[PDB]
Structures are given as structure tokens and as C-alpha cells.
Ligand binder design. Sequence first.
Ligand SMILES: *[C@@H]1O[C@H](CO)[C@@H](O[C@@H]2O[C@H](CO)[C@@H](O[C@@H]3O[C@H](CO)[C@@H](O)[C@H](O[C@H]4O[C@H](CO)[C@@H](O)[C@H](O)[C@@H]4O)[C@@H]3O)[C@H](O)[C@H]2NC(C)=O)[C@H](O)[C@H]1NC(C)=O
Ligand SMILES: *[C@@H]1O[C@H](CO)[C@@H](O[C@@H]2O[C@H](CO)[C@@H](O)[C@H](O)[C@H]2NC(C)=O)[C@H](O)[C@H]1NC(C)=O
Ligand SMILES: *[C@@H]1O[C@H](CO)[C@@H](O[C@@H]2O[C@H](CO)[C@@H](O)[C@H](O)[C@H]2NC(C)=O)[C@H](O)[C@H]1NC(C)=O
Ligand SMILES: *[C@@H]1O[C@H](CO)[C@@H](O[C@@H]2O[C@H](CO)[C@@H](O)[C@H](O)[C@H]2NC(C)=O)[C@H](O)[C@H]1NC(C)=O
Ligand SMILES: *[C@@H]1O[C@H](CO)[C@@H](O)[C@H](O)[C@H]1NC(C)=O
Ligand SMILES: *[C@@H]1O[C@H](CO)[C@@H](O)[C@H](O)[C@H]1NC(C)=O
Ligand SMILES: *[C@@H]1O[C@H](CO)[C@@H](O)[C@H](O)[C@H]1NC(C)=O
Ligand SMILES: [Mg+2]
Ligand SMILES: [Mg+2]
Lengths: 595, 12
Amino acid sequence: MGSLNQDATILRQAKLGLSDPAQSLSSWSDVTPCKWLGVSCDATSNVVSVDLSSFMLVGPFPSILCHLPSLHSLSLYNNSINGSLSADDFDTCHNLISLDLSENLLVGSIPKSLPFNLPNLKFLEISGNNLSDTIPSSFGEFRKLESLNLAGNFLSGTIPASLGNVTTLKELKLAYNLFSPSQIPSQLGNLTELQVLWLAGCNLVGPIPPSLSRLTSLVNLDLTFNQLTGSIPSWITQLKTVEQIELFNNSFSGELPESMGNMTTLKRFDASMNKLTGKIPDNLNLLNLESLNLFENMLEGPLPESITRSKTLSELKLFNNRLTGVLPSQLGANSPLQYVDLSYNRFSGEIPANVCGEGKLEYLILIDNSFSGEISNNLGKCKSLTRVRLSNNKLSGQIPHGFWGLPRLSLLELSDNSFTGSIPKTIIGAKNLSNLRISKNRFSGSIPNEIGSLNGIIEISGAENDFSGEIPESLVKLKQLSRLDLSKNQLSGEIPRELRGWKNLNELNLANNHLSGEIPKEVGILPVLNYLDLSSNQFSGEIPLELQNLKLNVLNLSYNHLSGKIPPLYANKIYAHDFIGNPGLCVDLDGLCRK
Amino acid sequence: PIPPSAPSKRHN
Ligand SMILES: *[C@@H]1O[C@H](CO)[C@@H](O[C@@H]2O[C@H](CO)[C@@H](O[C@@H]3O[C@H](CO)[C@@H](O)[C@H](O[C@H]4O[C@H](CO)[C@@H](O)[C@H](O)[C@@H]4O)[C@@H]3O)[C@H](O)[C@H]2NC(C)=O)[C@H](O)[C@H]1NC(C)=O
Ligand SMILES: *[C@@H]1O[C@H](CO)[C@@H](O[C@@H]2O[C@H](CO)[C@@H](O)[C@H](O)[C@H]2NC(C)=O)[C@H](O)[C@H]1NC(C)=O
Ligand SMILES: *[C@@H]1O[C@H](CO)[C@@H](O[C@@H]2O[C@H](CO)[C@@H](O)[C@H](O)[C@H]2NC(C)=O)[C@H](O)[C@H]1NC(C)=O
Ligand SMILES: *[C@@H]1O[C@H](CO)[C@@H](O[C@@H]2O[C@H](CO)[C@@H](O)[C@H](O)[C@H]2NC(C)=O)[C@H](O)[C@H]1NC(C)=O
Ligand SMILES: *[C@@H]1O[C@H](CO)[C@@H](O)[C@H](O)[C@H]1NC(C)=O
Ligand SMILES: *[C@@H]1O[C@H](CO)[C@@H](O)[C@H](O)[C@H]1NC(C)=O
Ligand SMILES: *[C@@H]1O[C@H](CO)[C@@H](O)[C@H](O)[C@H]1NC(C)=O
Ligand SMILES: [Mg+2]
Ligand SMILES: [Mg+2]
């Protein structure tokens, strides 16, 4: 009874100093306090832990909670605790082992006196506030702290060297603050029990200090988004329990450490956006690897065959390097490949036929390589695909039939290859298709009517092919269509007269075909049309006056069979290049007509 | 919020 009374009163007093607009603490408003929401007790009925995570509470830090004599854990994670921390707020909190103030609205400085007032803490988190000024050097006095998280504040100055005296630390998270440009303090090498070191976005310069080789229990080393220089040190390779190395967006130079191949525990490795040279290490035995990102470097040589030993690999992004050679033929057969982006390299030979062997591949991005041969019929059945970009390669043959109708495919980009064949009617199944980009190929036959059923289409880009027959009337009711480019084909017939469905059409390019009839008057009523190119066709009749409504970046009606007068808005000689090659046309230059 | 400690999501 005694302890239930005490606890209930202190808890109610604390609650009175907060605003609770979500009624999260209604249970504190019959029942023993040991069963109130967020409240845990020990066997003698004393409150030991108060967890008010995500309760939408507003107001100053409720330091009255510290008057509970057995309180060991306090979490106010993700509320609206506001104002600043004073020295006084923590005077009575000296029994705490765990304190979580992350994701609140706190401002101002960390009190210098915090370690003195909270000497028993093992876990301190104040991540995601607006804390400013420096991390106090007194933080070097904590005798028991295991985890420190100050990530995502406006803390400035530099990371204090005295943190190296907190040799009980297992996690140190200081990422995304406003520190001055400085080196990683060498003294952090004394934190020999560290498992997590997260100093992303900390304005770090210079090398990773050699002392950090003493951090032999590292599991996650994350130094992303800094300006670190020199080699990625080869001691990361001998970490027996390393799972994650994140070093992207730095200025690392030299080569990937040669013996990376033996890091059997490694799950994720990202050293993208650096200045790495040399080759991808070979004899890979990266048994646990899930993600390998090495994009935007100056890597050369091949993707080693031994990558296929990584039977859990799901993400491989190597784009923007100078990699060469043929891909390992078995790539993807034995891995749940999800995201593959090898663009802007010099790869050659065929696309591995089972890149989607496990049925998980979503992105297949191979732009700007010299891949040759055909797309495997396998890929025609890769139903998980959303984003395919195969442009600017040396691919040939007919596209696999089912590829056109994949149910989740959003971007299909095949441009600048030598693909042949007609677009099949199975394109009707591509319900999610947004962008069809197939220019600069040898596709033949007629544009199938079913492309008009794909209501989401925003782009049909088919220039420089061998398309013939008519533009299907169906395209004219694609409400979201932004860009229609079918220039340099063999299309015939007319443009449909009813075009009000084209409310989003920004570009209409049908130059260099065999199109006939009149330019329909409704071209000029399209609300966002900025590009119109109908040149090099057999359009006849008069240029509609409604074109004068539009603000056209490009207007080109040259090399047709058009007649009558040029609309008066375009009568100046600066637009003359728009209308050349229409022998029947003239300009009304002050009275008579000039050809 | 704060970017997680995880792989870059950049891609083409
Ligand atoms: C790769 O990493 C580099 C650095 O290693 C990175 O450059 C940095 O990017 C940040 C964020 O985009 C840039 O910061 C800017 O700073 C200027 C002031 O000089 C301001 O315009 C902005 O700061 C605002 O910050 C507050 C928001 O909380 C506002 O309230 C305030 O009024 C400011 O306007 C802006 O964020 C900067 O270019 C650098 N910074 C540093 C420290 O290097 C680069 O972007 C990274 N590239 C990629 C692709 O990831
Ligand atoms: C912070 O707390 C807010 C409010 O409690 C959380 O927002 C809720 O998120 C859940 C999903 O888990 C939804 O069911 C609710 O509808 C959301 N409510 C509101 C008002 O947004 C928010 O997710 C929490 N943030 C974190 C990082 O945990
Ligand atoms: C914490 O700082 C942030 C960033 O300065 C503030 O968030 C908003 O910032 C944008 C511009 O970055 C402004 O348009 C908003 O007006 C800011 N929100 C406001 C005033 O509510 C945020 O205000 C800061 N939080 C506190 C509690 O001071
Ligand atoms: C309007 O379109 C015509 C072609 O339909 C353009 O003329 C071609 O321009 C290129 C220059 O890059 C030449 O290689 C072709 O030989 C030209 N064709 C003919 C038949 O002359 C013309 O330049 C475009 N006009 C404007 C003003 O952009
Ligand atoms: C804390 O938040 C409330 C409501 O948003 C506000 O009225 C109060 O003055 C805030 N306190 C401080 C110190 O900003
Ligand atoms: C703490 O760290 C500082 C800075 O490296 C150092 O000078 C001091 O001797 C260390 N000792 C103790 C007992 O905290
Ligand atoms: C990998 O190889 C290097 C030497 O070649 C060695 O120092 C390191 O301890 C090895 N790592 C593992 C995890 O076996
Ligand atoms: Mg090999
Ligand atoms: Mg295209």
C-alpha cells in the first residue's frame, strides 16, 4: 500500500506538468499504478520504469518522475517535450540507468553537469532534437555508459577527445550534427569495446586514424557523408564480427583492400562516391553479403565470378566506374537479386540469363555499356520488375513476348539498341506502365491500339524506328500523356481531330513520317503543349489560327504540303525557319504575299 | 528525419 501510494502521487504530479491532448495517460486519471499504461514496477510495488514512447505529450522535461526512488528507466521517446535542459532538471535523476529523450522539441545546450547528476547511466539518447553548442567535455567522466546517441541535432564545435575515456562504450552515435571541420579524434581508439561507431555527416576531414584498428569488436562502422581521405584501411578486413561498413560520399582513394574477400560476416558494404581506383578484389567468399554498393568511383577490371558465392545478395550497384569484361554467367541464379544497377561502365557480352532466377528482381539498370545478344526469354517472366533501363548498349533480336506486359513494370527503356519485331498486343497487361522509351531501334509494324488502354502512361517515345500504318485513335484518350515522340518512322494517315483528352500533352513530335490531312484545329486548345514538330510530312490545308494560343518552344511545320497564310503571330522573319519547304505557303508582309 | 545508418539508395 505504502509504495503504491507514493508512486501514484508522484506519477500524477508529473502528469499535471504535461499537456496530453491524445489522452495517452487516461489510465493515470480504480487500478494500482503498477498497471497504468507505460508504468512498470518491481516486486515491492515501486515504480522502476516509465516508458511514455510516442504518447504525444507536450511540455517541459517532467523531472518530478525522478522523485520515484526506484526509477531506473525513463523514456520520453517521440513526444513534444520542449524548452531546454537545465542543470537542475536532472539533480534528482541520479538513480537512472537509462534515459531516452530522442525525437522531441528540445533546444539549447547540453548541461555540463549532466554526467555528475546522472552517474549511473548506461544508455543515453537525445537524438533528433534541436540541441546546440558543444558536446561537454565532462562526458568523459561517465563510468558506466554503454550507449550514447546524440545524432541529428545542431551540436557544433568538434567531437571531444575525452569521449575516449568512456571505455565502457559499446555504441557511439553522433551522426548528422553541425561540427566544425575536424579529424576523428585519435582517442576514440581507446574505446576498445565499441560495436557501433556512427559519425555520418560530421564534417570529418583527414584519414581514419590508425588507433581505430584497436576497435576489434566493431559490428557497424558508418562514416558516410564526410570528407575523409587516404586509403580504406585494410584492418577492417580482420574484424571478426563486422556486419556493416558504410563509407559512402567521402574522398577515399587507393584500392579496396585486397583481402576483403574473406569478410565472411559482412552483410552490407557501401563505399560509393569516393575516388577509388584499381579492381574489385577477387576470391570473394562473402557468404553473408546482402548489399554491395561501389558506384561513382574509378574502378576498373571485371566483376569477379566469385560474387556468385554470395547466396543472399540482393543489391548490387556498381554504376559509374570503368568496369569491363563479361558478367558472371550465373549472376542471380542463386541470389535474391532485387536491385541491379551497372550503368555507365564498359561491360560486354550477354546479360546473364538468370539475373531474375529467384523472382525478386525489381530494378535492372544497365544503361551505357556494350552488352550484346538478346534479352533472355527468362526476363519475359520476371513479374517483379518495375524499372528496366537497357539503353545505349549493343543488344539485338526480338524482345521476349511477356516483357511488354509485365504487371508492375513502370519504366521500360530500350532505346538505342538494334531490337527488331512488332510491339505485341500483350502490352495490354502492363497496367503500371508510365514511360515507354524505345527510340533508335528497328521495331516494325503498327503501333498497337492496346497502348491506348494503359491509363497511367505519361511518355511514349518511339522515334527512329520502322513503325508504319496509322497512329491509333486510342492514344488520343490517354489523359496523362505528356510526351508523344514518333519522329523518323513510316507512319501514314492523319492525326485524329478530337484531342481534348490530351490535357497533359506537353510535346507532340511526329516529324519525318508520311502523315497526311490537315493539322487539326484542336492542337491549339491543348493547355500545356510547348513542343510541336510536324515537319517532313505531307500535311495539307491551312495552318490553324489556334496555334497562336500556345507558347511554343518548338514549332516546326517545314517540309509539308501546306497552303494559305502564315498565322500573323508568326509573320516575323525570325519564325521563317518554322515554315520553309511549303511551296503553297506565304507571309502577309504589308499587303501582298511573299513566298 | 535522420538518414538511417544504411546503404545509399541512389540509382539510375
Ligand atoms: C556528399 O557529402 C557532402 C559533404 O560531405 C555534401 O555536401 C553538404 O550537403 C549539405 C546538405 O545538402 C549542404 O548544406 C547546406 O549548407 C548551406 C550553408 O552553407 C545552406 O544552404 C543549407 O543549410 C541549411 O541548414 C538548416 C536546415 O536545418 C537551415 O535552417 C539553414 O538556414 C541553412 O539554409 C544546406 O543544408 C552543403 O552543400 C554540404 N555541407 C557540408 C558540411 O559539407 C553533399 O551534398 C553530399 N552529396 C550527396 C549526393 O549526398
Ligand atoms: C511518433 O509518434 C507518432 C504519434 O504517436 C506516430 O504517428 C503514428 O504512427 C502510427 C504508425 O505506427 C499510425 O498508426 C498513427 O496513425 C500515427 N499517428 C499520428 C498522429 O501521426 C509516429 O509514427 C511516431 N514516430 C516514430 C518514429 O515512431
Ligand atoms: C528545430 O529546427 C528546425 C530547423 O530550423 C525547425 O523546423 C522548421 O524549419 C523550417 C525551415 O528549415 C521552417 O519553415 C519552419 O518554420 C520550422 N518550424 C517551425 C517554426 O515550427 C524547428 O522549428 C526547430 N524546432 C524548435 C522546437 O525550435
Ligand atoms: C524543322 O525540321 C526539319 C526536318 O524535318 C529540320 O531540317 C533538318 O535539319 C537537320 C539539321 O540537324 C538536317 O540534318 C536535315 O537534313 C534537315 N532536313 C531537311 C529536309 O532539310 C529543320 O532544321 C527544323 N527547323 C527548325 C527551325 O528547327
Ligand atoms: C512548450 O509547448 C507549448 C505548446 O506548443 C507552448 O505553449 C509552451 O510555451 C512551450 N514551452 C517552451 C519553453 O517553448
Ligand atoms: C580524459 O580524456 C582527456 C582528453 O584526451 C585526457 O587528457 C584525460 O587525461 C583523460 N582522463 C580522465 C581520467 O578522464
Ligand atoms: C583476412 O585476411 C587477412 C590477411 O590476409 C587477415 O589479417 C584477416 O584476419 C582475415 N580475416 C578474417 C575474417 O579471417
Ligand atoms: Mg573470382
Ligand atoms: Mg526513347
